[PDB]
Design a protein around this ligand. Structure first.
Ligand SMILES: [Cl-]
Ligand SMILES: [Cl-]
Ligand SMILES: [Cl-]
Ligand SMILES: [Cl-]
Ligand SMILES: [Mg+2]
Ligand SMILES: [Mg+2]
Ligand SMILES: [Mg+2]
Ligand SMILES: [Mg+2]
Ligand SMILES: [Mg+2]
Ligand SMILES: [Mg+2]
Ligand SMILES: [Mg+2]
Ligand SMILES: [Mg+2]
Ligand SMILES: [Mg+2]
Ligand SMILES: [Mg+2]
Ligand SMILES: [Mg+2]
Ligand SMILES: [Mg+2]
Ligand SMILES: [Mg+2]
Ligand SMILES: [Mg+2]
Ligand SMILES: [Mg+2]
Ligand SMILES: [Mg+2]
Ligand SMILES: [Mg+2]
Ligand SMILES: [Mg+2]
Ligand SMILES: [Mg+2]
Ligand SMILES: [Mg+2]
Ligand SMILES: [Mg+2]
Ligand SMILES: [Mg+2]
Ligand SMILES: [Mg+2]
Ligand SMILES: [Mg+2]
Ligand SMILES: [Mg+2]
Ligand SMILES: [Mg+2]
Ligand SMILES: [Mg+2]
Ligand SMILES: [Mg+2]
Ligand SMILES: [Mg+2]
Ligand SMILES: [Mg+2]
Ligand SMILES: [Mg+2]
Ligand SMILES: [Mg+2]
Lengths: 97, 172, 386, 62
RNA sequence: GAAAUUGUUGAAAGGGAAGGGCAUUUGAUCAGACA
RNA sequence: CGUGGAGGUCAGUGACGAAGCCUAGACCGUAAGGUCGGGUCGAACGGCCUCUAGUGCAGAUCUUGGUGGUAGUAGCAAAUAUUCAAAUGAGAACUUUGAAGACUGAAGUGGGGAAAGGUUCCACGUCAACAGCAGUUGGACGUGGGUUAGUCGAUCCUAAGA
RNA sequence: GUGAACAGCCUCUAGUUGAUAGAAUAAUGUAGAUAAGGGAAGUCGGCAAAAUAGAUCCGUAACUUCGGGAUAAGGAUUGGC
């Protein structure tokens, strides 16, 4: 199926106790594993706009929470984009038409 | 080209080989033994799973001081690895042998690996520098690989002994 | 030549080898000697360790400085839901040791017990004990024959019981099954008691009572591979030591030309079977009883669960046993409670304990409120509630 | 493609360092054909190659 | 196109070395006389 | 008993296969050794009577060359740090472009030179070997291009000295 | 820019982003660190580490070749507006 959903990922607990020089690279791999869990696609592609959001405050300044838009497209692959919001708190999973 | 000792019918078999391949001899020997005697299609699917780290190659001879994994329980061993470089070389030769079998006219459904053998190629030499201005060797161990695929196919008696036999016959 | 100065050896040689236990449930290797002039009863019980807390009580010991004075003590709480009897086993004396002769199972078994017999429960056809239940389809002649054989030949009778893991906050879903020896009465009486309790539950208060000394058997907390300094308690080598200092400097003399078994070496620490005795029971709690953590002095209505719940465990909703001191094993681990193997009369036993107060403050920090009502009385109304 | 030589020429022609040279990722076909300094000048003129602005070092707090 | 050393196939043995001497069992293999 | 070579002899053997090599196949001799069959191989070689010597190896921390066990083992951890996408390609953690995050912080990881090196400079083609992983990249490989002075130096002068 | 400063620390121009990688976080190490109460009882030996530290003001002994000793010793102060 082709479906688009918006997710909130808790990067704070996924980067707990990680070496400072590896936190931003680790968040990239955590997001790839997050998309594979929800979409079942081994192929995950991250938009460069999302990459700027992860590295916004350096290698060890990753935000606690990020609001993500994940789209499964035609065998299948996932494309992850950032969502521009004021705050990432209080948001739940929704389906985008 | 003259191959190693084989006991199969040449008319029902196809062969492939490669020489002076710059791949570890020890790793390639373990990989070749893992598919020796297997069906061609079964072997090809198994080699793909090794590259995905779903199944492993058991190391039985050149295995000193290596790690152990749970994927060796399929073959009743503890020590196994995933030699990707040697697997790809074997995959190429399996593809070539199947192509030669198709050209002859052999159906691929009944094909199995009847012969596979890895031999040691001449070494390639480089230098490495040691403490106190010494030089030691730094060499590779290339291998020769050959394989063959074949279709599956499915009174002296003494006078006393003669008298005893004759006597028993007239009894019953 | 002789060692320059004398010191006692490091470590106990009777707790060897320091290897991992064969199973997470520690074995019971000795039951109390049977007295057959008593009613049939269990000799042990199964529970899960939840955590520790603190109590206050008045000390009753003449001659002590703190006689008739309050003392603060640490206790351990064990979650003990009722166990279910699902079988019996008979043993025969033999010149080669005790041998099991016959096993008789109950007619119906729940999914808790059946999960113990599977490693891939979600894929199985769940065929366990399906043909054995057919032995009850007839008039029970097959079951009667096996029970008669136990009565005729057995000298030791034990019952198979399993925990009700679904009543605990644990996520295991797979119950623990164990044998418990029956003491008291004749062999026929033991078998009749076991037969009548098939598919029934046995509560902890029928086994243990207040002010009773019990023994705890469990597997200790694991720590992986450990160096000699912490594994055995050897002296640290001086700071000047090349090649590291958390070591034993000399591991043996020239002769014998071998390393001896009595020399400290690095290896596994923790996850060992242990049996600790003389642990007095301070309270036998009831799950359905509100005010579990209440005393005759405090009078407030509160359960035994601290504010926020036991850390890493959860809430206590079943019967529990409160025991003085500490117990081997960590939280969420199955433990076995055993009756004493001897009669203790050291005046530390047989003394009546009356709890005056039970601490229910949060164990997740420097908790300062016993109940939510007390917190409201102190801080007053907050922005969230107005 | 390998546009290493084009970036070196562009920096020399514009007069800034290689760190200030921007080559259009969507025009690598025509950039690869530019091997002379005259060809680079034409690409700079039509906006295929641009000069990036200097990083600001403000002295407001000073 | 020898040896050290190595791969495959076939046969045999192996409870902290292996190899050897005398004798025979078992398996495999083989010459001689049928005057 | 065996080996290289020499005189004599067997009108000796041989491309219809000499010599050499392989052979838990056979025979002779107490033994040094000799003989035969099978396989491989391709051009010379042997018996006997005598002559002659650079004539017989398990060792010499022997000489030269080749090869093992160790072992897929020790290890490939100084100099703060990498990430996303596109392009190219049989193949991309390492090539190119863009974006982001960082460092050298003007006694620099910047911009020029003296010695020394000698084409390493530049373009095109291109990956067997080399760059202790990789490689489509390179100070690698192949083919070509490039260093312009009356004023900058040498040349001239003299120093210790020769 | 900070500051006495060609010190350390941050930035602009310019130049690099090179040093085999991925996963995990046992023991023992190498490097960097912190400790209740005691305070050299350790050790051949205070080895190692800790304490002290800039600037302004106050105050400064024996001895002396009269030049020193001397930052002797011992105290106080320090931001922002
Ligand atoms: Cl050397
Ligand atoms: Cl002991
Ligand atoms: Cl002889
Ligand atoms: Cl450590
Ligand atoms: Mg070993
Ligand atoms: Mg190792
Ligand atoms: Mg070296
Ligand atoms: Mg040197
Ligand atoms: Mg055990
Ligand atoms: Mg030392
Ligand atoms: Mg706590
Ligand atoms: Mg040849
Ligand atoms: Mg050989
Ligand atoms: Mg011949
Ligand atoms: Mg031989
Ligand atoms: Mg010829
Ligand atoms: Mg000689
Ligand atoms: Mg020799
Ligand atoms: Mg000798
Ligand atoms: Mg030698
Ligand atoms: Mg290593
Ligand atoms: Mg290693
Ligand atoms: Mg090292
Ligand atoms: Mg480094
Ligand atoms: Mg720095
Ligand atoms: Mg900096
Ligand atoms: Mg160049
Ligand atoms: Mg390399
Ligand atoms: Mg390569
Ligand atoms: Mg060249
Ligand atoms: Mg200043
Ligand atoms: Mg201290
Ligand atoms: Mg203190
Ligand atoms: Mg002392
Ligand atoms: Mg002392
Ligand atoms: Mg010192």
């Amino acid at each position: 199926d082709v479906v688009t959903r918006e997710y909130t990922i808790n990067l704070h607990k996924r980067l707990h106790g990680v070496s400072f020089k590896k936190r931003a690279p680790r968040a990239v791999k955590e997001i790839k594993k997050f998309a594979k869990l929800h979409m079942g696609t081994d192929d995950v592609r991250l938009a460069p706009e999302l990459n700027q959001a992860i590295w916004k405050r350096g290698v060890k300044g990753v935000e606690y929470r990020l609001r993500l838009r994940i789209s499964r497209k035609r065998p299948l692959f996932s494309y992850v984009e950032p969502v521009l919001v004021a705050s990432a708190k209080g948001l739940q999973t929704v389906v985008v038409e | 080209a003259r191959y190693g000792a084989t006991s199969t019918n040449p008319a029902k078999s196809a062969s492939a080989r490669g020489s002076y391949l710059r791949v570890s001899f020890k790793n390639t020997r373990e990989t070749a033994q893992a598919i020796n005697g297997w069906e061609l299609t079964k072997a090809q699917k198994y080699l793909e799973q090794v590259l995905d780290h779903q199944r492993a190659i058991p190391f039985r001879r050149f295995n000193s001081s290596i790690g152990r994994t749970a994927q060796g329980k399929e073959f009743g061993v503890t020590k196994a690895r995933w030699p990707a470089k040697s697997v790809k070389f074997v995959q190429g030769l399996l593809q070539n042998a199947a192509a030669n079998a198709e050209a002859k006219g052999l159906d691929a459904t009944k094909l199995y690996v009847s012969h596979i053998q890895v031999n040691q190629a001449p070494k390639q030499r480089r230098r490495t520098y040691r403490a106190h201005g010494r030089i030691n060797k730094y060499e590779s161990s290339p291998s020769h690989i050959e394989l063959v695929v074949t279709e599956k196919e499915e009174v002296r008696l003494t006078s006393r002994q003669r008298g005893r036999i004759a006597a028993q016959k007239r009894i019953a | 030549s002789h060692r320059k100065y004398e010191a006692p050896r490091h470590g106990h040689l009777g707790f060897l080898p320091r290897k991992r236990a064969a199973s997470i449930r520690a074995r019971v290797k000795a039951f109390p000697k049977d007295d057959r002039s008593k009613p049939v009863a269990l000799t042990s019980f199964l529970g899960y360790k939840a955590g520790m807390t603190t109590i206050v009580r008045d000390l009753d010991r003449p001659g002590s400085k703190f006689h008739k004075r309050e003392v603060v003590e640490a206790v351990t709480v064990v979650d003990t839901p009722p166990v279910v009897v699902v079988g019996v086993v008979g043993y025969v004396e033999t010149p080669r040791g005790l041998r099991s002769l016959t096993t008789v199972w109950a007619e119906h078994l729940s999914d808790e017990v059946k999960r113990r017999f599977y490693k891939n429960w979600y894929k199985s056809k769940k065929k366990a004990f399906t043909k054995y239940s057919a032995k009850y389809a007839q008039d029970g002649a097959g079951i009667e024959r096996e029970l008669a054989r136990i009565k005729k030949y057995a000298s030791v009778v034990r019952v198979l019981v399993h925990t009700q893991i679904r009543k605990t906050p644990l996520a295991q879903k797979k119950a623990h099954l164990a044998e418990i020896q029956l003491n008291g009465g004749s062999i026929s009486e033991k078998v009749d008691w076991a037969r009548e309790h098939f598919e029934k539950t046995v509560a902890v208060d029928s086994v243990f009572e207040q002010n009773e000394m019990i023994d705890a058997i469990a597997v200790t907390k694991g720590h992986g591979f450990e160096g000699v300094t912490h594994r055995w308690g050897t002296k640290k080598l001086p700071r000047k030591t090349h090649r590291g200092l958390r070591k034993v400097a000399c591991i043996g003399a020239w002769h014998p030309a071998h390393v001896m078994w009595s020399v400290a070496r690095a290896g596994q620490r923790g996850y060992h079977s242990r049996t600790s005795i003389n642990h007095k029971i301070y309270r036998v709690g009831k799950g359905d009883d509100e005010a579990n953590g209440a005393t005759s002095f405090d009078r407030t209505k509160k359960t035994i669960t601290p504010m926020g719940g036991f850390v890493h465990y959860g809430e206590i909703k079943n019967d529990f046993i409160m025991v003085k001191g500490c117990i081997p094993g960590n939280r969420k681990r199955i433990v076995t409670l055993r009756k004493s193997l001897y009669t203790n009369t050291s005046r530390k036993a047989l003394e009546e304990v009356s709890l005056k107060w039970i601490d229910t403050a949060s164990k997740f920090g420097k908790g300062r409120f016993q109940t939510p009502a007390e917190k409201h009385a102190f801080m007053g109304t907050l922005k969230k509630d107005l | 493609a390998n546009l290493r030589t084009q970036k070196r020429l562009a920096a020399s022609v514009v007069g800034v360092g290689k760190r200030k040279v921007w080559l259009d990722p969507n025009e690598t076909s025509e950039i690869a054909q530019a091997n002379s300094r005259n060809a680079i000048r034409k690409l700079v003129k039509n906006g295929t190659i641009v000069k990036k602005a200097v990083t600001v070092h403000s002295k407001s707090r000073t």
